[PDB]
Structure formats: C-alpha cells, structure tokens
Design a protein around this ligand. Structure first.
Ligand SMILES: [Cl-]
Lengths: 221, 5, 221, 7
C-alpha cells in the first residue's frame, strides 16, 4: 500500500463544513463519504445535503440534531432512492420537516460496506483503494476542542465509546521515515477555524487510537 | 453503540 | 443575488495547486477561471496547464516566473486556439521552452470579460452568475503569508497596487445576518498547507479590501 | 499607483 494517501489532492473532498450547535456529525461524515464515492463514479464533486439527512432519516433510526449513525444515513439514501444537493436543501443546524424532492437528488447508494472492526490495517487498505471513509471516534475530551496542529494523541481516548462521526480522507507520516509519526488525515465538521484548517491528524497504528478503525464504513454506489 | 453527535 | 455562493460545492474547482518559487500566480488564477468555465460548458472538470501559460504567453505581454496578468493569459488562449491539460504539460516552476501541443488542448476561450473596476457589487454579480472569477490582490504582507483562519483584514492592504493573482470561488458571511461579517472565498496557489486548506476568506464590502474588485476578469468560453 | 505584475 502507498506510504501516504490524500484524497483531497484528487478531487474527492468538498470544503470543510460546520454542523454548529446540532449533533449532526453523523450526517456530515456520511455526506463526505457519499461525495467521494459519487465523484469517483461521475467525475463531478457535488456537496450533499446534511439537512436532508437530519430531517428525513428518522425512519431509519437517526435522531437529527440529537445524533445518528452514518450507516443508517446510507440506509436512508438507499430506501429513499436519492439524496438532495446541499444547494437545493441548505443546512440550518436544527431539526426540521423533511423536504426531500427527487428532482433535486444528485446521489444514490445501494447499501454500504463495513471495514473489519478494530483493524487499522483494514482501514488503511480501504482508504487506499476506495476513497474517503466514514468513521466513528471518541471526541469527548477538551484536548479535541482545542486541537490546533500536530498529531493528535489523547491518553484518555477510548476506542469503544464513540460519540462523533468524521471522515478519513487519507493517511501519512511526519518526518523522513514512513513508519513513524504516522497519522490518519481526518476531515471534521466543526468549521475551518477548528484545528487550524478543519482537519486533524490522528495518531495512526497506535492501538486504534480514539477508535478510528472501530466502526468504519462507506456507501456502495 | 451511542449516537454520533 | 444569492446570500452566499461556493462554486467548490458544485464541482467547478480543482484541488489547490502550488506555484512554488516562480512568480506565476497570474497563471494559476487564469487556469482556475478557465477550469470553472470549461466545467460550466461541458460538465467535465479538467486541470489546466499553468506551465503552458508561463512558457508560451510572452508575446501577449506576460513574463513567466517573473510575473504576468490573467487578461493577457486569456488573450493568449484566444490567439492560440487552445490550452493544454495539466497532465499533458506539467508544472515545473521555471521558465521553459514553449511546448504547446494542439492535440492535448482541453480548453478554449474567445476572449475575456472585465468586471467594472473597483466595484465589489459588480464582482458579486459576476461570481454569482458566471462561476469562479480571476482577481488581483495585494498579498505583500506577513499577515497574509501566515493567514490561517477568520476574515482576513490587513490595514496596510492596498486596493490599487496589487502584486498577486488569485481566484474568487464564492462569497459568504458569518453568523445569521447575511448583510454583515461578509467575505470573499479565495483560492490561493501556495499549496493546500497554506492558509485554510489553500484558501482565505477576505473581508467583503470593506471598501474593496486588498483590491479584490480592482482588476477582476473571466474568460469567455 | 504602480504597474506591478501579479507574481
Ligand atoms: Cl489581469
């Protein structure tokens, strides 16, 4: 596998978005992964509607701003037959009535694939061959809110208690040697000011730090 | 598991 | 006009590039604008050759790695009949022999349109109705070199003596009021590591800050 | 004013 991967360099990733005061990270993580897969299928990068997911996917088990799951989001897109563009269905960071219109849909999926749980090498292989991957992580620590740069390593991080959904867009390493100071390249949904540019380098191959490889998946397009 | 807010 | 526009979310914009030690920003700004207009015309996003412009547009008045102007580049593309892809005419950041190949051309323009100088409302109308717009700006400040987050505002910025070419890919605002804390979304050519993933928010409706609306133009395709 | 090239 490549020593480094960065799907942003290849056109797979939309700009950093901001969920604001709505517990909708699961929706941003799912649209990030579907955006990468729809791009690989069509050559066209089109931002998808988190608000469509927040307002419409309660039947699949999501709870809007009260939380949800990326896999249930991909299940909604499958059952619904489509998912609207963000341009047509803007984000307002509150729970609202579903306004989905098929004429505005720009994405579809047939289900989703789960990465072998707990296995960072399985996630490295999925990232290298598929594109961006949705993942769950433990973001429940003040060090995460205040993160600015460098490889994030939180001693109290859990790989099982996962309260946040984010997007792995790549992996890399700091310094001349490919095997040390390794990290996952993670797109967050807290705006471009958080993390200096909205991304965080999470320690890689350090025992599934913060659970990045515990519950990783991507839509089937 | 728990919801991913 | 729309309260906000972001052409990156519609597939019009290539990933951030890096001009390195060569004064070729005018070339990156021009290929960025032509990339957006070719996408609007064909639905296909194809990275364009800045090296083609650096090496071949001296007759039109450009000076390669010593500087140039986006309108002279769009004039070159018109007189030349074409512009090669980035893949077929790679970037090497030094002045080289013109190797333009018509068989590798993936873009054309019939000339260019100029935005009324100095008018940010005219630039806003161009950005909203056309796509990404080439603009000149005053980037001669350490505050720009070390920019990372927020709306950029530099007291020493000039609106008339401009040393850099960049691409306005949209505009937006912070907060809930669309009529204040406004910004221009600007793509730079200093690599993704610079700024916010290669981008900067420049203060909008603050008296043509840093000259963004002084010398704006777009190719006609 | 000055005629700066856009480097
Ligand atoms: Cl110009």
């Amino acid at each position: 596998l490549p020593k480094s991967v960065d799907w942003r360099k290849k056109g797979y990733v939309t700009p950093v978005k901001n969920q604001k005061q709505c517990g909708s990270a699961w929706a941003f993580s799912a649209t990030g992964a579907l955006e990468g897969q729809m791009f690989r299928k069509t050559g066209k990068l089109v931002s998808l509607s988190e608000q469509n997911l927040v307002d419409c996917s309660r039947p699949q088990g999501n709870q809007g701003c009260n939380g949800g799951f990326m896999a249930r989001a991909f299940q909604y897109v499958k059952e619904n037959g489509g998912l609207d563009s963000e341009e047509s269905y803007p984000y307002v960071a509150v729970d609202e009535i579903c306004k989905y219109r098929p004429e505005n849909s720009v994405a579809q999926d047939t289900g989703f694939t789960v990465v072998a749980p707990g296995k960072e090498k399985a996630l490295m292989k999925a990232v290298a061959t598929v594109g961006p991957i949705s993942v769950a992580m433990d973001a429940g620590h003040s060090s995460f809110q205040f993160y600015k740069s460098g490889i994030y390593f939180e001693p109290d991080c859990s790989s099982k208690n996962l309260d946040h959904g984010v997007l792995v867009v790549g992996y890399g390493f700091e310094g001349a040697n490919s095997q040390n100071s390794k990290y996952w390249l993670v797109k967050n949904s807290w705006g471009p000011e958080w993390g200096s540019n909205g991304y965080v380098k999470i320690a890689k191959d350090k025992n599934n730090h913060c659970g990045i490889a515990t519950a990783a998946s991507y839509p089937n397009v | 598991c728990k919801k991913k807010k």
